[PDB]
């Protein structure tokens, strides 16, 4: 519940979204030693991550993102997504899911320098805008509770609900 | 008219019945971005929802439901309500109205974990038993047609007619 701890687990999770699906090996980021706690979180998020991968309306919007000049697209999404001073785990999770495919959309266009670059922005944005609220949720473990074991496909609708809804605004305001 | 679309609008409407009247903010479900189409549906259902709120014979039966062990009461109602392989919008609407107050009857007994849980069951039941028929009605927009603008208080009688009639059977078969 020290920033450190939250930052730490944060990168770990973030990296989870990424390396699970897909590039100079010398600059690679050595996998972060998971333990029990962060095991169930990641075990969970990969379950979300595929229901989301399977949401087309989201996939469409995702497809509409600047595949290789995404500095601005990320920070404007992240801004709007919490533009209301509230926070739920849905929102956090989505931001993470979004960042993930930002990468996969760049790895495909083969610009691996940015793995780091994006992982940078997020965890930055984590610290600047969320470290507080998470700290005040007893840390990440709350996020498990956000996902009880039958209600997968339901929350996921609402969680894509917001992410789509925000990409969409970006899509029109330029 | 893809399941997605129908599922989507489905949650949106469902959530409409609920959050319009009334609880850990961290697990909250972020409101689903409405558009024009689903605007009139929800604009409509809230008009039904109050004529129903105002039907006492229904309110009585509603009062007789297990306030906090409702897994079975819901699925047995939903079963009987379409136990005849026919479908009208009245029936659908009522199922939705019922689920709504199931929640409000639980929020009052302060068990907010179940918001999700019930929203789960319904949209499940939506998919398994209704996605077909709605798909074959050109989707939800048909439901508007079920409610022409003078004949409010009439259909509502028949719509409560069925819902009461089904709770009633549950009330006796145990």
From Swiss-Prot, chains A, B:
InterPro entries: Bcl-2-like_sf (IPR036834), Bcl-2_BH1-3 (IPR046371), Bcl-2_fam (IPR026298), Bcl2-like (IPR002475), Bcl2_BH1_motif_CS (IPR020717), Bcl2_BH2_motif_CS (IPR020726), Bcl2_BH3_motif_CS (IPR020728)
Domain remarks in the Swiss-Prot or TrEMBL record: Intact BH3 motif is required by BIK, BID, BAK, BAD and BAX for their pro-apoptotic activity and for their interaction with anti-apoptotic members of the Bcl-2 family.
Record keywords, A-Z: Acetylation, Apoptosis, Cytoplasm, Host-virus interaction, Isopeptide bond, Membrane, Mitochondrion, Mitochondrion outer membrane, Nucleus, Transmembrane, Transmembrane helix, Tumor suppressor, Ubl conjugation
Keyword RNA-binding: no
Pfam families the record matches: Bcl-2 (PF00452)
Keyword Ribosomal protein belongs to the record: no
Post-translational modification: Ubiquitinated in the absence of XRCC6/Ku70. Ubiquitination promotes protein degradation. Ubiquitinated on Lys-110 and Lys-172. 'Lys-63'-linked polyubiquitin chains on Lys-110 are removed by USP12.
Effect recorded for residue 171 to R: No loss of polyubiquitination
SUPFAM superfamilies associated with the record: Bcl-2 inhibitors of programmed cell death (SSF56854)
UniProt gene name: BAX
Protein name: Apoptosis regulator BAX
Domain of life according to the entry: Eukaryota
Annotated phenotype, changing residue 166 to V: Constitutive mitochondrial location. Enhanced fiber formation with humanin
GO molecular function: BH3 domain binding; channel activity; Hsp70 protein binding; identical protein binding; lipid binding; protein heterodimerization activity; protein homodimerization activity
Annotated crosslink Glycyl lysine isopeptide (Lys-Gly) (interchain with G-Cter in ubiquitin) location: 110, 172
Motif stretch (BH1): 80-100
